[PDB]
């Protein structure tokens, strides 16, 4: 019950919400070898555009430590898109999602399947709490997500849900992006 059954490299499942409830969505990225650049589409608001800029800066620094020979994030012209195209989107909570998509694309490695994540990323890779955890978790469960990555400071929201919703979910409460990296790329 979602746009991708199997995600290719550069595609990651995120989580959103409104007053009506949660939903899943996908961050898509692609690149062409020609300093690189990042072009963003998907009717993104300013806060979400800034989060893409932070994620891009941090992903470049993270990849330089983890794979110094990989120059894809420093030299390529990268495009990031969040379908559906006509739907307005905003907020900082896809920061981790965007970092992961860029690293996935640069490494040519898909992320673990049936994984979704939500979490704001700071410039140094700290993972900050987000809103809508109850709604997002319900939406993840309905979409068949079995592994969900959440900010550690949102534990209380997760445990406000009835047990039958969260039972057997592999839940990871994280404080730093490097924990997310190890989950997405085992
Ligand atoms: B996250 O909660 O910040 C998320 C980021 C990304 C996945 C879109 N954004 C949202 O959930 C927003 C609500 C919002 C949160 C925080 C600040 C401002 C706005 N939701 C949406 O953008 C949305 C929801 N459903 C469908 C389409 N778009």
UniProtKB/Swiss-Prot annotation:
The active site is at residues 93, 136. This is Lon protease homolog, mitochondrial. The Lon N-terminal domains are crucial for the overall structure of the protein, maintaining it in a conformation allowing its proper functioning. Homohexamer. Organized in a ring with a central cavity. The ATP-binding and proteolytic domains (AP-domain) form a hexameric chamber, while the N-terminal domain is arranged as a trimer of dimers. DNA and RNA binding is stimulated by substrate and inhibited by ATP binding. Interacts with TWNK and mitochondrial DNA polymerase subunit POLG. Changing residue 93 to A: Lacks both ATPase and protease activity, but retains DNA binding activity. The gene is LONP1. Disulfide bonds: none annotated. Residues 6-186 form the Lon proteolytic domain. Changing residue 17 to P: Has normal basal, but low stimulated ATPase activity, and abolishes peptidase activity. It is found in: Mitochondrion matrix. Duodenum, heart, lung and liver, but not thymus. The chain holds residues 754 to 948 of 959 of the full protein. Changing residue 17 to A: Has low basal, but normal stimulated ATPase activity, and retains peptidase activity. ATP-dependent serine protease that mediates the selective degradation of misfolded, unassembled or oxidatively damaged polypeptides as well as certain short-lived regulatory proteins in the mitochondrial matrix. Endogenous substrates include mitochondrial steroidogenic acute regulatory (StAR) protein, DELE1, helicase Twinkle (TWNK) and the large ribosomal subunit protein MRPL32/bL32m. MRPL32/bL32m is protected from degradation by LONP1 when it is bound to a nucleic acid (RNA), but TWNK is not. May also have a chaperone function in the assembly of inner membrane protein complexes. Belongs to the peptidase S16 family. It is linked to CODAS syndrome: A rare syndrome characterized by the combination of cerebral, ocular, dental, auricular, and skeletal features. These include developmental delay, craniofacial anomalies, cataracts, ptosis, median nasal groove, delayed tooth eruption, hearing loss, short stature, delayed epiphyseal ossification, metaphyseal hip dysplasia, and vertebral coronal clefts. Changing residue 131 to A: Has low basal, but normal stimulated ATPase activity, and retains peptidase activity.
């Amino acid at each position: 019950e979602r746009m991708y059954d199997v995600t290719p490299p550069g595609v990651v499942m995120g989580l959103a919400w409104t007053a009506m409830g949660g939903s899943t969505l996908f961050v898509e990225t692609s690149l062409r070898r020609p300093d690189g650049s990042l072009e963003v589409t998907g009717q993104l608001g300013e806060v979400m555009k800034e989060s893409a800029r932070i994620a891009y800066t941090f992903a470049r620094a993270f990849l330089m430590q983890h794979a110094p020979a990989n120059d894809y994030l420093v030299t390529s012209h990268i495009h990031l898109h969040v379908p559906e195209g006509a739907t307005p989107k905003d907020g900082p909570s896809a920061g981790c999602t965007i970092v992961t998509a860029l690293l996935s694309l640069a490494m040519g490695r898909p992320v673990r399947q049936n994984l979704a994540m939500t979490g704001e990323v700071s410039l140094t890779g700290k993972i900050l709490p987000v809103g809508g955890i109850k709604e997002k978790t319900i939406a993840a469960k309905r979409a068949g997500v079995t592994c969900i990555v959440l900010p550690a400071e949102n534990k209380k929201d997760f445990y406000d849900l009835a047990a039958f919703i969260t039972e057997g979910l592999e839940v990871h409460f994280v404080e730093h992006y490097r924990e997310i990296f190890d989950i997405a790329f085992p």
